[PDB]
Amino acid sequence: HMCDAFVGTWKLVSSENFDDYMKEVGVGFATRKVAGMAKPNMIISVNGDVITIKSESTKNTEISFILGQEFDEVTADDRKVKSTITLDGGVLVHVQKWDGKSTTIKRKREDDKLVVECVMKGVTSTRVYERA
Ligand SMILES: O=C(O)[C@H]1CCCN1C(=O)Nc1sc2c(c1-c1nc(C3CC3)no1)CCCC2
């Protein structure tokens, strides 16, 4: 019953500061513009200890992982990162490390929304998803 409140299909309904977050991460102009237009669906499922998070839009990406166990991830902007995802007080905390840099993506349930907060140095972006 780990992560039950996260499981399902979620659709993006609002975004703030995502371009600036992508700039900070180092995403190039064309990818920022196309990514910024996307209205992804996020599909979260659990089977045993394995959590799967898919992002589907007009790129489709998927990660599967066990909490606390590092994995290699190729991100939507083609960074090759080492990722670890943990549950901290009900919040899924995803840390990505690459080339001496680090970014953290937090996913939390708030009312009927799933809120995704992305942070790189001083820059925070907030993305809000609702059930599909
Ligand atoms: O899951 C979320 O809400 C947030 C969590 C952080 C990533 N993220 C996205 O939505 N990333 C998305 S969605 C999408 C693209 C990217 C994309 N991210 C980045 C770098 C910032 C990582 N570069 O492209 C490009 C093409 C198709 C649609």
Curated annotation (Swiss-Prot):
One GO cellular component term noted in the UniProt record for this chain: extracellular exosome
Binding site for a fatty acid: 127-129
Keyword Cytoplasm assigned: yes
UniProt GO molecular function: fatty acid binding; hormone receptor binding; long-chain fatty acid binding; long-chain fatty acid transmembrane transporter activity
Compartment annotation: Cytoplasm; Nucleus
Motif window: Nuclear localization signal: 23-33
Sites of Phosphoserine modification: 14
Keywords: Acetylation, Cytoplasm, Lipid-binding, Nucleus, Phosphoprotein, Transport
Modification sites for Phosphotyrosine: 21
Principal location listed in the UniProt entry: cytoplasm
Keyword Transport appears in the UniProt entry: yes
Subunit structure: Monomer. Homodimer. Interacts with PPARG.
Swiss-Prot/TrEMBL domain comment: Forms a beta-barrel structure that accommodates hydrophobic ligands in its interior.
Physiological role: Lipid transport protein in adipocytes. Binds both long chain fatty acids and retinoic acid. Delivers long-chain fatty acids and retinoic acid to their cognate receptors in the nucleus.
Protein name listed in UniProt: Fatty acid-binding protein, adipocyte
Organism from which the protein derives: Homo sapiens (Human)
Gene, per the UniProt record: FABP4
